[PDB]
């Protein structure tokens, strides 16, 4: 009786898979049927999704079905191909081959879109659509893809915490009648604030006061043995132009002379003028440190610095600044540094009136002689058997002395170039501030930081106070301060800008 041949079925489309586009097309399939009693013209048949397709064997054993519905191949992923053959006698046989293929009607649409914005979705996969009736689908994150009258799909991208442990890739799958699915993957991108540069200005008033000569007198003291106060002499302290007692000495000399203080006024250099908002030397303070028998030294002394101030109509006003010194004539040991005597000046002040304007003269401290730019200190240290000399520096300020010239602001306001943009995350604060052009998140917000001419306190809410500490004589024309600040939003995005302060003199 007849002998069966070999039937084989080629791949169903190139990838042996029926996809969502092929679903709606007519698919040709093909194969071969050879051997046994198979012959050209033999019937080939197959049932796919309960539909019957047939053809005949052609020369070379090739068989081909012109058009099988993609929907049938999607519904039926495995089928037999059966060829019916006959031999000489007329005996029949059937030869069976098998075909399997995959079915995947899905398609992906992948997007990377900014949070907190509406976006038209472009380059969607071919055939993408909503099932009829549907005009909106809700995403995994609670976003929405909406179909508009213009045929465009719009995604409302939610705001996300891009710093936490939860993925910010949104998704949704649309399923259609015919079995197709479309998975839209929407990688939500983080938004950020935009810091905008800020401009502020401050002008330091530069008034000139007409003043008389200074008279400096040691007026009181606590403790001490053999204490004497006197007008300076060539041998003890040097001479000055008045009879006030600028010298004070104390102690029972254990080696030679008495310890003490001298103060030579600056009448000659001042030339009868004070300047507002300017560190001024009122004179030269000398500490004369000799060894004296233990216990014999003062522990404090007070000096009155008296002068008159003229107003704009030739009327003089007397002013007395009281200057207080704490003295430590330390026990002498075999350590020179430990044996130094220490003088500490208090930061006292006196307020006066001129032409109805109130001014305060305040002690700044001691400064090294001849160095107007030197550091000003309030304690000085003198070796035994030595004398040290320092300018006694004051500053005259406007008002009651509570503060220096200053200006205020908020770096989130429009300060010349517009207000800082906050982004979609919100919770924006200032997290760094620094003098200069470079800033990172740091530990200076809410602290006082030193600039070139003054100090800045910038707070996390953007509020700032800048006060000018430099003397008027140290502020060149066109002087400016630059402070860089860094803002940061809820999930770490940072932006920096510059607060520039024009520091002028008048």
């Amino acid at each position: 009786e007849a002998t069966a041949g070999t039937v084989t079925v080629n791949a169903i489309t190139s990838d042996d898979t029926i996809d969502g586009i092929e679903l709606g097309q007519t698919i040709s399939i093909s194969g071969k049927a050879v051997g046994g009693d198979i012959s050209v013209g033999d019937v080939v048949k197959m049932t796919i999704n309960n539909t019957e397709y047939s053809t005949t064997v052609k020369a070379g054993g090739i068989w081909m079905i012109a058009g099988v519905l993609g929907s049938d191949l999607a519904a039926d992923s495995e089928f037999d191909v059966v060829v019916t053959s006959s031999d000489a006698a007329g005996n029949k046989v059937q030869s069976i081959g098998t075909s399997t293929h995959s079915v995947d009607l899905s398609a992906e649409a992948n997007f990377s879109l900014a949070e907190g914005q509406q976006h038209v979705l472009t380059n969607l996969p071919e055939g993408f659509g909503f099932p009829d009736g549907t005009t909106e689908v809700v995403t995994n994150f609670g976003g929405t893809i909406t179909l508009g009258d213009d045929g465009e799909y719009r995604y409302d991208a939610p705001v996300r915490d891009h710093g936490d442990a939860v993925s910010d890739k949104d998704s949704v799958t649309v399923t259609l009648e015919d079995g197709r699915t479309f998975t839209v993957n929407l990688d939500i991108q983080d938004s950020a604030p935009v810091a905008v540069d800020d401009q502020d200005s401050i002008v330091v008033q530069h008034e000139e006061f007409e003043v008389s000569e200074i008279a400096a007198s040691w007026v009181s003291y606590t403790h001490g043995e053999s204490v004497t106060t006197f007008d300076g002499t060539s041998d003890l302290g040097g001479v000055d132009n008045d009879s006030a007692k600028d010298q004070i000495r104390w102690g029972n000399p254990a080696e030679s002379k008495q310890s003490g203080y001298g103060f030579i006024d600056n009448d000659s250099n001042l030339e009868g003028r004070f300047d507002l908002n300017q560190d001024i030397s009122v004179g030269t303070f000398t500490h004369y440190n000799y060894p004296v028998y233990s216990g014999g030294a003062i522990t404090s002394a007070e000096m009155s610095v008296e002068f008159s101030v003229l107003d704009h109509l030739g009327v003089s006003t007397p002013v007395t600044l009281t200057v207080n010194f704490d003295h430590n004539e330390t026990p002498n040991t075999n350590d020179v540094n430990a044996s130094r005597d220490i003088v500490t000046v208090q930061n006292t002040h006196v307020t006066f009136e001129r032409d109805g304007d109130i001014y305060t003269v305040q002690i700044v401290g001691f400064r090294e002689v001849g160095n107007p730019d030197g550091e000003v200190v309030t304690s000085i240290y003198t070796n035994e058997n030595a004398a040290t000399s320092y300018e006694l520096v004051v500053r005259v300020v406007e008002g009651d002395g509570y503060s220096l010239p200053s200006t205020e602001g908020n770096i989130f306001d429009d300060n010349g170039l517009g207000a800082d943009s906050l982004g979609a995350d919100g919770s924006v604060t200032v997290v760094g501030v620094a003098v200069g052009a470079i800033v990172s998140s740091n530990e200076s917000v809410g602290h006082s930081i030193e600039g070139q001419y003054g100090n800045l306190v910038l707070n996390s809410d953007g509020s700032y106070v800048y006060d000018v500490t430099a003397s008027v004589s140290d502020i060149p024309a066109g002087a400016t301060e630059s402070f860089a600040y860094l803002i940061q939003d809820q999930d770490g995005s940072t932006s920096s800008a510059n607060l520039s302060i024009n520091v002028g003199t008048n």
């Binding site: 102690g251 254990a254 060894p291 004296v292 028998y293 233990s294 330390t330 026990p331 002498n332």
Partner: peptide, 4 residues
């Protein structure tokens, strides 16, 4: 000590 004995001196200051």
């Amino acid at each position: 000590g004995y001196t200051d």
